[PDB]
Amino acid sequence: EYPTVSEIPVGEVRLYQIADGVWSHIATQSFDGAVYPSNGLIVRDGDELLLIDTAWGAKNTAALLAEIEKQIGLPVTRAVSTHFHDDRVGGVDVLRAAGVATYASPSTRRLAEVEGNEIPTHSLEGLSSSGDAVRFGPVELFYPGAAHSTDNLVVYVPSASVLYGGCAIYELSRTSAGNVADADLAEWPTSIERIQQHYPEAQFVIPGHGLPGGLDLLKHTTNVVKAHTNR
Ligand SMILES: Nc1nc(C(=O)O)c(Cc2cccs2)s1
Ligand SMILES: [Zn+2]
Ligand SMILES: [Zn+2]
């Protein structure tokens, strides 16, 4: 069963096998007086692994590398951060020290710098416009438009029909948008629609936080965002 926030002590990382050669990683961290779970993705890349997002902080990201080595045993050689928040880039310095080449779009790298967050080393060209997609080894990176943040990327694994939505996709049990400081609430529904349109075959959809679902999470997230638009 998918691990929940109460089951993962802060500082520990779980891996969850989604499909052959595709895992999520799950960690926990405090924000504003509460502890939240957070997901990223791991994808087999030949004899290497591609990491999607840090485990939300340096200590957690170190535990991620250790659990990957214990459970999978192949080297993490590249990492992509899907936007500029700490649950996506926090721990990039650990990855760099471990020999991982870290990547983000130029938009993410600028926004991280303004915010004072860690900055991935390498810039991903080809993702500046809504609807843009690029191949990155075993995945396709997709920029759907502004949503949770202006830079948020989603990631699709074609070999497995896994869509990683990151923080632009809410888990089903989440009923309130909560903190939307950096969001674009007017663009979010249209960006979700571009995701649905480009990845209609997605069999698994992983939110940035909480339990996996299927494509129903997209419309779920929309309705939760519009409920904040109205009141
Ligand atoms: N690092 C964090 N990101 C987010 C986010 O919404 O993306 C947080 C708020 C959450 C509310 C419920 C589950 S997560 S905390
Ligand atoms: Zn975020
Ligand atoms: Zn988040």
Side-chain angles (χ1 to χ4, degrees), residues 165-178:
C167 292
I169 301 299
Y170 285 2
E171 66 163 333
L172 260 196
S173 73
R174 186 161 174 190
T175 56
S176 71

Side-chain angles (χ1 to χ4, degrees), residues 65-85:
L65 294 178
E67 285 291 337
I68 291 172
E69 176 62 21
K70 171 185 152 163
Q71 297 199 43
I72 303 173
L74 302 180
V76 179
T77 63
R78 300 185 289 177
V80 175
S81 293
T82 63
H83 66 271
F84 75 98
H85 288 155

Side-chain angles (χ1 to χ4, degrees), residues 22-54:
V22 187
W23 306 256
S24 63
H25 62 82
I26 309 96
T28 54
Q29 190 54 259
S30 60
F31 170 63
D32 192 21
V35 163
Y36 298 87
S38 188
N39 299 324
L41 214 67
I42 302 160
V43 185
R44 192 181 64 87
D45 182 17
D47 60 323
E48 310 178 343
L49 308 169
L50 169 58
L51 184 62
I52 311 296
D53 288 324
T54 64

Side-chain angles (χ1 to χ4, degrees), residues 99-186:
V100 180
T102 63
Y103 298 77
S105 73
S107 176
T108 299
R109 297 179 78 253
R110 285 112 127 241
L111 278 161
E113 183 173 33
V114 164
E115 213 72 354
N117 296 342
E118 296 164 63
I119 300 166
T121 294
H122 301 286
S123 284
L124 299 160
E125 302 315 320
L127 288 165
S128 32
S129 174
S130 313
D132 280 350
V134 298
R135 174 64 38 166
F136 199 77
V139 303
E140 183 178 75
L141 309 172
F142 187 67
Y143 174 49
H148 167 83
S149 67
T150 70
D151 54 323
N152 50 206
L153 309 178
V154 303
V155 179
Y156 192 71
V157 193
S159 62
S161 309
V162 175
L163 180 67
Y164 178 74
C167 292
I169 301 299
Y170 285 2
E171 66 163 333
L172 260 196
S173 73
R174 186 161 174 190
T175 56
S176 71
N179 173 37
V180 280
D182 296 329
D184 189 330
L185 294 169

